[PDB]
């Protein structure tokens, strides 16, 4: 597992997860407040 | 001498150890990174097999996995557009309504503004219009629900697992040997029997008991509901015997010889299906039988484990004649060694049959409803002459890499290659001289008639009207097959296809297909096409036999295959190796691709696409090509100017995103002209500059900040100059063609 | 079917064809052709242990009988094909 | 031995393998580089299992037909081998105390634990005499041959005493598995051509061969 | 010599045996690391526990309902308890995170730092909090039978009969999620009806479990 976890630490697979979390993040804030253009 | 099944078993164990060490494979990579050069270097030696290890078994073993991986990609891609067709698309309403209902298989979530792109397609429906055409495929084979499109996606998923799961147990579980893979009498004997003929068997076995009566009932008014099931008819001899009398005897009449009384679905009515405007489904399942058996007979002529058949080496020494010298010694040796060799004739081969599909599937639509869906037909023939380009320049790079690496002069003493490589100066001069004689006479004639035309004198141009340069053996070749059905085809009904002349087929009030006249601006076009065509030869070939020597550096191979350049010596030596020689041909290419898919649209959107009108048919442009296609001005007006109005006005309807896409396309492809205008020396300045404001705030990175190097900042731009160019083509024939196809 | 022209033309392709490879007269698994179409020995792989005087095995029969149902199909097809 | 023996296939097939006949001209025992499943100890133990496992098809496809028409059972079975519940779109049988999936579930479960056990003495010899097993490991031992395990459920009279008897046995299990396995081959055949069971098929025959046979159930 | 998951197979380096339930049955290796397999093992005791709880809960509540006495199923026991009772939903909710929230808090910081919650710092209880094993936290206030502090093999005893059955309730969980979403009936309306018919009252005449049905 050691091994697996160490491959999941990489930098592409640690981007992607990064990526798709703060794109989710991103997504799920402009669906729950559509159309956010000012403060 | 014996053919049989070698293997080893357990060569590799399966672990997570490597995963977690990139650059293992490699011994140059598996030190580890220390600058950025390092990891672009990661991905490029990636599937670089010869060069991990010179032992070819382990290269033929990784090959093997290699295909499993990708038909396991290929499966995954497939099961997913069965699923997409069963989950979010209007086949079923599309089934009830195939000429007014758009196909439609994509849905878009309602999230910052997108759920415009959600057009109504018909049917009830709201989504994208697709091109690739799965719904006339999904007809012709006789689907008529979700739930046969849910298992087949289910099913694709199931192969893909088996795919995966192949691949895996073949490197490390039961890995071939190296006399495995060098049956290559065994394996084509297999894949001429076995895969094309027992493949073509089947799709014929299906095509007469499913496609052929589901469909011969949608096209007499059944509903699709009220249509028995594939099982149905597959079950009892009442219903096919009622649609076809000829089942009520049973196999009987295929052993008596008697085949005469199948003649109900095994004819050769030819032309196209009045109802649907595709091939007659009978017709394509007689060429399926046809074809199955003539690859079941090619596939017993080469020896395997007895003495009947043939040996290709036999076969290779027996022709030699007295202006070749010794002959095609040697070839099999070379073919059963090296796998760029057989990479560079199976993707030249690969490419020219993908044109030839293109040209075949515009030509003689084969499924029901195709031809009525102009973006379906532009976008596939414009797909399948891509990919087929692209495979052609992947088979001059291979040619070449096997110059470089596994060519040895100590088995190519006085054989074909050798005397080729002993007059390549001959060939290379003869075929420049062709490229240059061929550029003149075709953009002269349209440089000239923009100058005529400018000046005010028509008369003095190349064009119908004025001095003409008809295609007489293109029409003469069109005349003959149209005759064809008559002396020299008595069997025949009708002919290969509606574009040699005859009555035109119009299905819905749109004409699926009508004759094509050639004038002289086809002539002029083709001209263009041929000089195109011969440029990008020129530039792979003189990069094949150029490849290991040249008149300006004679230790070529020494420096390899892919290399930036010898240095600033000889006045200059830059891109003199093969790889950049690849480089060249692919924005020959992309050249000379964009020019024929143009002509493609150009001529069937004015000559062939249209309404059908009381008494006479009224095409897309009004049969301009004919008039404005002879000069530059008439294809940047009426054909780029005036057929971008569609691309640019998409703002605020479903095709708004093509649109954007449009500009994106745009911006890529202008990004390459950053890599390909300037050189890494001022971006490695630039680097030291940057890296210095770094280690000012001590945020400098270990790894050390290197720029791209001169063969990545090539790749970098042919990829970004070829991906903006395709990509803003395809947005403007798809916004076009969907608007007002 | 029994005594029909399909039935006996078939019948005397195929006795024809197994009658020419066993008599020596057509390529074998045990004699090969060369490129003057003359016969000469092979190195066939198998190696079928056949009890025949001449060595006929049964891939012999199985290529023999192709052979002549390729001939006695294109022949009763083509007979078929002129009206005669 | 039989026809299509080679001098290639003889090299590996001296007689030690029961029923060796020495008919394999597409050389899948050569213990030559091989792995997987094509070699000679799963290949064997694959013939005897295929072969009991058709012997127990092809008389359980041929007895109710036979008993029917003997007047032993009733008019209610008596069914074709395909037309009783096997493939539902040939016909089903409605007679059952229950549906076919709860049955085949039943199947599943039986089916799972027979064959994983066997599969797992057949990959470890003997493995399945140590887990307690409700006190059935001691018949489960086996022996060194996975295709002959033995033991006092599997051989219960001890038949076999001496090696030369327990070698004709064996050939005459493997020759009645291969005639078993044609026989079902030729069940499913008949089934798709004729549409009726094989021993309506035999009977047919046995009428009048002129006119019941391949040739005339063409059209 | 310990039996296993699967007979036959030899068990895994990372499964000794010395665990309470160890049959060696870990095909994915996700324990292999021995604090991966720590923090495994108290998330396998925690969630048998609440299983257990659930399962028992969920049985009783069904022998009230089938039994003329007005209990709710437990698919609608929230809105009925919610609904019967002015209680309001977040302000419950809020109290339970908080008080589950201290209590896996100390335990979490327990785990990290063995013996830590011992030091007297929350109203002076010390021996309460000290800890026996791992996923085993032995005490007066937790144990104050004092099982878990005599007679060792009886103790490991009942360490299998926990583990066992806190697995068993987990599948009961599981199962009664699933006969709810295919049935849509509680547990025990579905015992009863298996009961009564149990050739065409099962898994494979529903419906929805078996789809080519």
């Known amino acids: 597992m050691k091994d697996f976890t160490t491959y999941l630490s990489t930098a592409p697979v640690i981007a992607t997860i990064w990526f798709t979390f703060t794109a989710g993040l991103l997504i799920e804030i402009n669906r729950y407040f559509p159309d956010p253009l000012v403060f | 001498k014996k053919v049989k099944i070698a293997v080893?078993?357990?060569?590799?164990?399966?672990?997570?150890?490597?995963?977690?060490?990139?650059?293992?494979?490699?011994?140059?990579?598996?030190?580890?990174?220390?600058?950025?050069?390092?990891?672009?270097?990661?991905?490029?030696?990636?599937?670089?097999?010869?060069?991990?290890?010179?032992?070819?078994?382990?290269?033929?073993?990784?090959?093997?996995?290699?295909?499993?991986?990708?038909?396991?990609?290929?499966?995954?891609?497939?099961?997913?557009?069965?699923?997409?067709?069963?989950?979010?698309?209007?086949?079923?309403?599309?089934?009830?309504?195939?000429?007014?209902?758009?196909?439609?298989?994509?849905?878009?979530?309602?999230?910052?503004?997108?759920?415009?792109?959600?057009?109504?397609?018909?049917?009830?429906?709201?989504?994208?219009?697709?091109?690739?055409?799965?719904?006339?495929?999904?007809?012709?084979?006789?689907?008529?629900?979700?739930?046969?499109?849910?298992?087949t996606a289910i099913g694709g998923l199931v192969?893909?697992?088996?795919?995966?799961?192949?691949?895996?147990?073949?490197?490390?579980?039961?890995?071939?040997?190296?006399?495995?893979?060098?049956?290559?009498?065994?394996?084509?004997?297999?894949?001429?029997?076995?895969?094309?003929?027992?493949?073509?068997?089947?799709?014929?076995?299906?095509?007469?008991?499913?496609?052929?009566?589901?469909?011969?009932?949608?096209?007499?008014?059944?509903?699709?509901?009220?249509?028995?099931?594939?099982?149905?008819?597959?079950?009892?001899?009442?219903?096919?015997?009622?649609?076809?009398?000829?089942?009520?005897?049973?196999?009987?009449?295929?052993?008596?010889?008697?085949?005469?009384?199948?003649?109900?679905?095994?004819?050769?009515?030819?032309?196209?299906?009045?109802?649907?405007?595709?091939?007659?489904?009978?017709?394509?399942?007689?060429?399926?039988?046809?074809?199955?058996?003539?690859?079941?007979?090619?596939?017993?002529?080469?020896?395997?484990?007895?003495?009947?058949?043939?040996?290709?080496?036999?076969?290779?020494?027996?022709?030699?004649?007295?202006?070749?010298?010794?002959?095609?010694?040697?070839?099999?040796?070379?073919?059963?060694?090296?796998?760029?060799?057989?990479?560079?004739?199976?993707?030249?081969?690969?490419?020219?049959?993908?044109?030839?599909?293109?040209?075949?599937?515009?030509?003689?639509?084969?499924?029901?409803?195709?031809?009525?869906?102009?973006?379906?037909?532009?976008?596939?023939?414009?797909?399948?002459?891509?990919?087929?380009?692209?495979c052609i320049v992947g088979a001059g790079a291979h040619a070449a890499i096997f110059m470089v690496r596994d060519y040895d002069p100590t088995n190519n003493y006085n054989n074909l290659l050798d005397r080729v490589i002993r007059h390549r100066d001959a060939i290379i001069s003869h075929l420049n001289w062709v490229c240059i004689f061929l550029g003149f006479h075709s953009f002269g004639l349209y440089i000239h008639n923009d100058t005529m035309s400018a000046l005010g004198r028509p008369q003095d141009m190349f064009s119908d009207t004025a001095i003409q340069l008809q295609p007489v053996f293109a029409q003469w070749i069109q005349n003959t097959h149209f005759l064809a059905p008559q002396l020299t085809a008595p069997n025949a009904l009708a002919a290969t296809s509606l574009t040699w002349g005859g009555d035109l087929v119009a299905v819905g009030g749109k004409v699926a297909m009508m004759p094509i006249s050639l004038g002289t601006s086809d002539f002029m076009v083709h001209h263009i096409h041929a000089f195109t065509i011969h440029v990008t030869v020129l530039i792979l070939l003189k990069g094949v036999l150029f490849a290991r020597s040249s008149r300006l550096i004679p230790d070529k191979a020494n420096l390899g295959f892919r290399f930036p350049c010898d240095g600033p010596g000889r006045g200059g030596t830059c891109q003199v190796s093969a790889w950049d020689h690849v480089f060249?041909?692919?924005?020959?290419?992309?050249?000379?691709?964009?020019?024929?898919?143009?002509?493609?649209?150009?001529?069937?959107?004015?000559?062939?696409?249209?309404?059908?009108?009381?008494?006479?048919?009224?095409?897309?442009?009004?049969?301009?090509?004919?008039?404005?296609?002879?000069?530059?001005?008439?294809?940047?007006?009426?054909?780029?100017?005036?057929?971008?109005?569609?691309?640019?006005?998409?703002?605020?309807?479903?095709?708004?995103?093509?649109?954007?896409?449009?500009?994106?396309?745009?911006?890529?492809?202008?990004?390459?002209?950053?890599?390909?205008?300037?050189?890494?020396?001022?971006?490695?300045?630039?680097?030291?500059?940057?890296?210095?404001?770094?280690?000012?705030?001590?945020?400098?990175?270990?790894?050390?900040?290197?720029?791209?190097?001169?063969?990545?900042?090539?790749?970098?731009?042919?990829?970004?100059?070829?991906?903006?160019?395709?990509?803003?083509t395809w947005s403007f024939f798809l916004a076009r063609i969907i608007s007002v196809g | 079917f029994i005594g029909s022209s399909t039935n006996l033309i078939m019948v005397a392709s195929?006795?024809?064809?197994?009658?020419?490879?066993?008599?020596?007269?057509?390529?074998?698994?045990?004699?090969?052709?060369?490129?003057?179409?003359?016969?000469?020995?092979?190195?066939?792989?198998?190696?079928?242990?056949?009890?025949?005087?001449?060595?006929?095995?049964?891939?012999?029969?199985?290529?023999?009988?192709?052979?002549?149902?390729?001939?006695?199909?294109?022949?009763?097809?083509?007979?078929?094909?002129?009206?005669? | 031995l039989y026809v299509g023996a080679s001098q290639s296939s003889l090299a590996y097939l001296d007689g030690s393998l029961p029923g060796d006949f020495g008919f394999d001209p597409l050389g899948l025992l050569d213990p030559v580089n091989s792995g997987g499943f094509i070699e000679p100890k799963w290949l064997q133990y694959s013939e005897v299992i295929h072969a009991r496992w058709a012997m127990l098809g092809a008389a359980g496809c041929i007895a109710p037909e036979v008993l029917g028409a003997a007047g032993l059972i009733p008019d209610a079975t008596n069914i074709k081998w395909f037309e009783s519940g096997v493939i539902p779109p040939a016909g089903s049988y409605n007679g059952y105390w229950a549906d076919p999936y709860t049955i085949f579930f039943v199947e599943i479960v039986a089916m799972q634990f027979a064959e994983l056990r066997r599969l797992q003495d057949f990959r470890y010899p003997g493995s399945m005499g140590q887990q307690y097993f409700l006190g059935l490991e001691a018949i489960f031992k086996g022996s060194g041959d996975a295709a002959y395990p033995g033991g006092p459920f599997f051989n219960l009279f001890n038949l076999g005493k001496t090696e030369a008897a327990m070698k004709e046995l064996k050939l005459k299990e493997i020759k009645n598995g291969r005639l078993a396995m044609l026989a079902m081959l030729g069940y499913g055949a008949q089934a798709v051509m004729t549409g009726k069971g094989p021993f309506q098929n035999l009977v047919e025959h046995l009428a009048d061969p002129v006119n019941n046979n391949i040739l005339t159930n063409f059209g | 010599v310990r039996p296993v998951w699967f007979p036959g197979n030899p068990p895994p380096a990372h499964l000794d045996g010395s665990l309470a339930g160890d049959y060696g049955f870990d095909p994915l290796f996700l324990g292999q690391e021995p604090q991966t397999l720590k923090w495994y093992v108290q998330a396998e005791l925690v969630h048998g526990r609440f299983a257990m709880l659930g399962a028992a809960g969920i049985i009783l509540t069904s022998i009230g309902a089938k039994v003329g006495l007005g209990f709710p199923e437990w698919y609608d026991a929230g809105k009925v308890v919610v609904e019967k009772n002015n209680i309001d939903f977040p302000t419950l909710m809020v109290i339970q995170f908080y008080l589950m929230g201290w209590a896996e808090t100390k335990r979490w910081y327990d785990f990290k730092n063995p013996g830590s919650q011992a030091d007297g710092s929350f109203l002076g209880f010390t021996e309460e909090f000290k800890g026996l094993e791992n996923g085993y936290p032995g005490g007066r206030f937790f144990d104050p039978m004092g099982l878990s502090r005599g007679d060792a093999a009886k103790y490991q005893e009942y360490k299998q009969k926990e583990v066992k059955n806190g697995r068993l309730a987990m599948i009961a969980c599981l199962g009664f999620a699933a006969q709810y979403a295919a049935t849509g009936k509680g547990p025990l309306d579905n015992l009863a009806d298996h009961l009564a018919d149990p050739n065409h009252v099962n898994f494979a005449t529903n419906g929805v479990s078996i789809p080519i049905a």
């Open chain 2, 584 to 728: 060249l041909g692919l924005f020959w290419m992309y050249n000379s691709l964009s020019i024929v898919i143009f002509h493609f649209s150009w001529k069937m959107q004015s000559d062939v696409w249209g309404t059908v009108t009381a008494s006479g048919v009224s095409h897309i442009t009004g049969g301009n090509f004919a008039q404005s296609a002879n000069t530059i001005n008439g294809w940047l007006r009426d054909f780029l100017w005036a057929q971008s109005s569609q691309v640019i006005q998409s703002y605020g309807s479903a095709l708004s995103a093509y649109g954007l896409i449009f500009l994106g396309a745009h911006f890529v492809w202008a990004f390459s002209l950053m890599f390909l205008f300037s050189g890494r020396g001022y971006w490695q300045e630039l680097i030291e500059s940057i890296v210095w404001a770094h280690n000012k705030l001590k945020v400098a990175p270990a790894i050390q900040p290197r720029a791209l190097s001169i063969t990545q900042g090539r790749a970098v731009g042919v990829a970004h100059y070829l991906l903006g160019g395709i990509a803003t």
């Open chain 2, 8 to 151: 080893d078993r357990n060569p590799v164990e399966t672990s997570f150890e490597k995963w977690a060490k990139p650059g293992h494979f490699s011994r140059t990579l598996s030190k580890g990174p220390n600058t950025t050069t390092w990891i672009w270097n990661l991905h490029a030696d990636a599937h670089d097999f010869d060069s991990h290890t010179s032992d070819l078994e382990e290269i033929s073993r990784k090959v093997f996995s290699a295909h499993f991986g990708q038909l396991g990609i290929i499966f995954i891609w497939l099961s997913g557009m069965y699923f997409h067709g069963a989950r979010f698309s209007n086949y079923e309403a599309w089934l009830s309504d195939p000429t007014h209902i758009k196909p439609s298989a994509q849905v878009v979530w309602p999230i910052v503004g997108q759920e415009i792109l959600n057009g109504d397609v018909g049917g009830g429906f709201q989504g994208i219009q697709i091109t690739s055409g799965f719904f006339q495929l999904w007809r012709a084979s006789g689907i008529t629900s979700e739930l046969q499109l849910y298992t």
């Open chain 3, 14 to 84: 195929t006795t024809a064809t197994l009658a020419a490879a066993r008599f020596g007269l057509a390529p074998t698994v045990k004699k090969n052709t060369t490129a003057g179409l003359k016969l000469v020995d092979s190195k066939n792989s198998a190696g079928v242990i056949s009890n025949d005087p001449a060595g006929f095995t049964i891939v012999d029969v199985l290529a023999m009988g192709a052979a002549g149902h390729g001939l006695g199909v294109g022949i009763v097809l083509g007979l078929k094909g002129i009206g005669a």
């Open chain 2, 159 to 390: 192969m893909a697992a088996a795919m995966f799961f192949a691949g895996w147990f073949h490197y490390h579980k039961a890995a071939p040997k190296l006399e495995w893979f060098q049956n290559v009498e065994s394996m084509l004997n297999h894949h001429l029997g076995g895969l094309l003929g027992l493949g073509s068997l089947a799709w014929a076995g299906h095509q007469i008991h499913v496609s052929l009566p589901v469909n011969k009932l949608l096209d007499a008014g059944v509903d699709p509901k009220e249509i028995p099931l594939p099982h149905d008819l597959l079950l009892n001899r009442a219903i096919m015997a009622d649609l076809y009398p000829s089942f009520a005897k049973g196999i009987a009449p295929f052993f008596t010889l008697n085949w005469s009384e199948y003649s109900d679905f095994l004819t050769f009515k030819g032309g196209l299906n009045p109802v649907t405007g595709g091939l007659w489904l009978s017709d394509t399942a007689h060429h399926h039988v046809a074809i199955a058996v003539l690859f079941l007979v090619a596939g017993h002529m080469y020896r395997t484990n007895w003495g009947i058949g043939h040996s290709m080496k036999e076969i290779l020494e027996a022709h030699r004649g007295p202006f070749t010298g010794e002959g095609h010694v040697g070839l099999y040796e070379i073919l059963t060694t090296s796998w760029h060799a057989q990479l560079a004739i199976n993707l030249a081969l690969f490419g020219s049959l993908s044109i030839i599909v293109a040209h075949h599937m515009y030509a003689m639509p084969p499924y029901p409803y195709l031809a009525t869906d102009y973006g379906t037909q532009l976008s596939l023939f414009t797909h399948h002459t891509w990919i087929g380009g692209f």
